[PDB]
């Protein structure tokens, strides 16, 4: 079975049967019961379970009202009718959620990946990270699908990595879908396309930044 779930506004009153013979439990998920009150003599024993919750036994034969107070300031009321049977467990819920905790992105990318991403972003804006002094670009970097002519514009060189910018010419007249891995050359770390690719048309000049290792041949 599954605990019976009851949703109540603060001060809410729910009529639930309990058991005279066996221990009964009431837990509020995410909350710790701090107090319990019942008419006198009605509840024989009250103990706090692990992770909140109350375990309680009743020798009573009369319907009674129990008030339970949680640590987050919520108070609920229950009307309990004692009846023969198995100990009953109830899950207490709050009708209105008090607050919405903001989501937490815990995932962390790899160091190499973040390094390339940071540089690509810096180049896209144009601000230079320290240790990048600018350099002549090569012609080695770009393989051309066809109809493309490459001219180097700007390039940065640093202590570990190197970036450069080449502008491809407009292709002929057939639409040329642009594949970011179709401009690959051994030795290149990352290649990214400015704007959104998605087929340069019967023409268009698009600047492409190519990232390659530094020092290593």
């Amino acid at each position: 079975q599954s605990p019976a779930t009851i949703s109540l506004p603060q001060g809410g009153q729910f009529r639930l049967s309990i058991s005279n013979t066996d221990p009964n439990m009431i837990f509020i998920p995410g909350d710790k019961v701090t107090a319990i009150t019942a008419p006198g003599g009605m509840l024989a024993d009250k103990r706090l379970t692990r992770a909140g919750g109350v375990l309680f036994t009743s020798v009573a034969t009369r319907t009674f009202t129990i008030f339970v107070e949680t640590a987050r300031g919520q108070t609920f009321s229950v009307v309990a009718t004692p009846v023969k049977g198995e100990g009953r467990v109830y899950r207490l819920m709050s009708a209105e959620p008090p607050s919405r905790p903001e989501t937490r992105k815990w995932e962390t990318a790899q160091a190499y990946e973040k390094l390339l991403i940071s540089l690509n972003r810096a180049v896209l804006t144009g601000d230079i990270p320290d240790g990048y002094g600018e350099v002549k670009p090569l012609s080695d970097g770009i393989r051309l699908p066809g109809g493309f002519s490459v001219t180097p514009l700007k390039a940065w060189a640093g202590d570990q990595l190197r970036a450069d910018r080449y502008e491809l010419r407009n292709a002929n007249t057939w639409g040329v879908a642009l594949r970011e891995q179709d401009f690959w050359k051994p030795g290149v770390r990352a290649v990214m396309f400015d704007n959104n690719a998605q087929t340069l048309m019967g023409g268009g000049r698009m600047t492409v930044t190519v990232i390659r290792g530094n020092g290593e041949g």
């Binding site: 107090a35 003599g41 109350v54």
Partner: peptide
């Protein structure tokens, strides 16, 4: 005695 109420506060 009648009318009184038992209440326990958990540490």
């Amino acid at each position: 005695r009648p009318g009184m109420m038992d209440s326990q506060e958990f540490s």
